[PDB]
Symmetry: D2
Subunit: 198 residues, 4 copies
């Protein structure tokens, strides 16, 4: 079927004072809403190019399909990886994978904060699992669909676009990145990590 | 463990006259082994950047880790996707999936040849499975790592970087992506389809 | 010598009510001065890689000098393409060139508003003169240095990164872009087209 | 007027043995003519999109104009910076410029060969002059149009695309880039630098 906007499982002002309800609102409502309309739209123009047998604008069509489909895919996962009752540290299988992988929790976290505040332009920090070589790696994604390999399973994303922190942190991106840690919903990530390794 | 170079399950000349045994051996033995060696070396300086706690070149190691891991993941699925004994059409569930998603294998095929031949630079054509929307969509990747959403599971790719056809097709890439079709191991696509929707 | 921050020919409050005074003071004071600092550091590090003969981080020093010199080149010409007493329409020579190059001032204005509001990530709309075909064309810039040819001389630029409008027009990109037209200082655009075509 | 494929000031084989005549010929006559047709067609779809007042596909028309116009300005300067009677060193002002900006002609050259051999995908190395701070600097361009600032004057470039050397050096691009130094035509570079500094 068509893609659609998921609802949040918290009220827009729930991450205050770490992330304002003004931002969650424009973000879920303006920003993600337009990526889901863009995704359904690129889907429908390729169905028509498929019937008129005219692949003359293939390049804008495959570029509009990857851009909206990926902004909706990262957005969808960023709402479930944040929680009002979040913070602290991961536990169980996940916390042991993370120290085995980056040596230690605080080390994984100095690299994740280093990959998210050095993007030149918009992009995000993403923790993913590579099934080719079964490892847990951190990637710096540019924009919404570039800089990582195909088939990588996404587990915890930090949105670096300016719309995610300009109305409250203005240009101090590092303090928005420090505040994200107090709202991480580690239960969602742990659950992502287990279906990833099954 | 370490990423390593897979062996093909055919002799390099096996694919002739569709793809000359000299490209199969410069592609596999030279281009792929360099991605496998660049992916183990980007995993190793992130390891030492974590130990000295020096994240000053984090933009370079995250960039060297996606380019080479993407080049290694995409050549490893191109060698299984190609076989001396393939060609023809998909069968079963995979062939009804295609027909149902693109209308017919013939319309699936003309869109895949448009996206593989209209790339501006190095890139490939990719048939993948989207888990969010449960759809079989094609994408146009630029280089090895860009232009598709995280988590898409790849099932059929066609390498259009110059090195996969210059020696025998010179500048005529269209001719190569038409030959391609005669050596597709649809049993390998069939198998990846079945596991992506398991 | 070293690169430095240009002063403005007007007080941050001067383009009110079209672009706020906070936005220009953060833009100039925070954003632009960082770029000016990072191009002087990309310069210093290549001098240092050249003295010790080690160019193992070339990909990186080549990307940071282009990201930061681009950004400082783009912002230094944005403070000049604007003005309290600006607005209206181009006069003289530039006018005719405009009307000749794009059919009309109103049709140049519609081609530049659409390339400005359709960028997928950060970017700007820029009017430039091509000295090889001696044509005035409008390009869509990705980030601060992508998507135009080497050697284009830049004449009027519209900053579309979110931080240039966020705090005041929120995700309403479209109203920052039309309000722009009432503060463009056409005298500075006419003098740079005159020197580029001398 | 329209853009057109310039004439080489030499015959295809005059570069032997440093770069084969078969490359120079499919390079000029197939790759370069394709970007000139493409630049020509992109400028016309904008004329046609500006008269029917329909900017639906502005992203593809501005991307097809920067891609193909950038490849035509790059190849047009590549046939002139190469020559059968070149090689050796720069002389005069160019050379004291080059040694005071990169330490010595031997250090500018190790830096340029570094930037042309680690590109990740298609690309070129180019030395250009920055008008803002008046300095010679080398850049690593991605594709034909990304990675440098607007307004930099190009002076010398080395095409790292595969099609520039795969048929004679195969994957050994560090060799192709070593042989280039015997074909550089320094009277051209030094003449583009005296006009750039005027
Ligand atoms: Mn976002
Ligand atoms: Mn390849
Ligand atoms: Mn800006
Ligand atoms: Mn070329």
């Amino acid at each position: 079927a068509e893609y659609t906007l998921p609802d949040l499982d918290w009220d827009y002002g729930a991450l205050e004072p770490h992330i304002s309800g003004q931002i969650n609102e424009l973000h879920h409502s303006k920003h993600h809403a337009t990526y889901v309309k863009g995704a359904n739209d690129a889907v429908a123009k390729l169905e028509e190019a498929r019937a008129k047998e005219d692949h003359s604008a293939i390049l804008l069509n495959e570029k509009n399909l990857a851009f909206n489909l990926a902004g909706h895919v990262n957005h969808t996962i960023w709402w479930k990886n944040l929680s009002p009752n979040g913070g602290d540290k991961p536990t169980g299988e996940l916390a042991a994978a993370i120290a085995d992988a980056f040596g230690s929790f605080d080390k994984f976290r100095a690299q994740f904060h280093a990959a998210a505040t050095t993007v030149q332009g918009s992009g995000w920090a993403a923790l993913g699992w590579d099934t080719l070589g079964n490892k847990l790696l951190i990637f710096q994604v540019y924009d919404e669909q570039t800089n990582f390999p195909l088939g990588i399973v996404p587990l915890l994303l930090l949105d670096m676009w300016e719309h995610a922190f300009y109305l409250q942190y203005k240009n101090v991106k590092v303090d928005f990145a420090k505040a994200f840690w107090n709202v991480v919903n580690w239960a969602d990530v742990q659950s992502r990590y287990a279906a990833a390794t099954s």
